[PDB]
Amino acid sequence: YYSTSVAKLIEELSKLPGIGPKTAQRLAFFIINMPLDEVRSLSQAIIEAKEKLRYCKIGFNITDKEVCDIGSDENRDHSTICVVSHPMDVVAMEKVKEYKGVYHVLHGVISPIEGVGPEDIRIKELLERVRDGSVKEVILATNPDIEGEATAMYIAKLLKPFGVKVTRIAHGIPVGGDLEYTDVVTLSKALEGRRE
């Protein structure tokens, strides 16, 4: 048992990803033991982050400013697009230190099972970009599952009309792994997309 305020915190904590029921218990107790001044920075930070957030006018990704920082670098090429899934996906890309182009998060995918379709994301929002400012490369880098693949696929064939160079990433087997410990579907799919 515990106070009502402690329960609440445990409820509010459990709504969080990867925080389980036991994990939310330990943390609650930890937080309430924290020096006051420090529990206030945490609460601060939580509230500061939200109100201080903006969805960039261009990439529609997370930042302080209107534009981005990726999208308002001088020495950058905003003609190599990258349709991507979710905010941390950019951070994943950008960790590559090669590829000096731009992006396109969506905070969703095509999921009739989880709801959202082409509307709830930035499709027609990009459809007003490539045809706009003339874009060389539009790379579609969503996850490789149903949502991931059958999203960027309903897009990639709508990059035939205007001359814009269309692309997908690479399904297949990862670098390092072997056919021995590799699942059939990944294998089925890397035999199909063989070409070179």
Residue from 8, 65, 136, 171 that binds a copy of itself (CB under 8 A)? 171
Residue from 37, 98, 114, 119 that binds a copy of itself (CB under 8 A)? 98
- Please give the structure tokens belonging to residue 80: 């190599």
Query: Nearer to Zn ion by C-beta: 71 or 108?
Result: 71
In terms of Cα–Cα distance, which of 177, 174, 178, 172 is closest to 190? 172
- Please give the structure tokens belonging to residue 109: 């995918």
169 binds a copy of itself (CB under 8 A): yes
Name the one range near a copy of itself by CB under 8 A: 2-10, 25-33, 49-57, 180-188: 180-188
Find which of a copy of itself, Zn ion, none residue 132 binds, CB within 5 to 8 Å per kind: none
Smallest separation (angstroms) from a copy of itself to the CB of 179: 4
What span, in angstroms and rounded, lies between the C-alpha atoms of 159 and 121? 17
Name the one range near a copy of itself by CB under 8 A: 1-9, 27-35, 62-70, 170-178: 170-178
**One-letter amino acid for residue 12 of the chain:** E
- Give me the residues paired with residue 104 across strands: 83
6 binds Zn ion (CB under 5 A): no
Smallest separation (angstroms) from a copy of itself to the CB of 83: 11
Residue 171 has, within 13 A of its CA and on its CB side, a CA count of 19
- Please give the structure tokens belonging to residue 131: 């045809």
User: CA-CA distances (angstroms) from residue 16 to 13, 48, 151, 190?
Assistant: 6, 18, 27, 36
186 binds a copy of itself (CB under 8 A): yes
* Contact criterion met (CB below 8 Å) for 122 and 151: no
Query: Which residues inside 106-145 make contact with Zn ion, applying CB under 5 A?
Result: none
56 binds Zn ion (CB under 5 A): yes
Helices 21-33 and 4-14, packing angle to 10 deg: 130
* Residues in contact with Zn ion by the rule CB under 5 A: 56, 58-59, 61, 68, 71
* Residues in contact with a copy of itself by the rule CB under 8 A: 84-86, 88-89, 92-93, 95-96, 98-99, 139, 141, 143-145, 148, 156-157, 165-180, 182-196
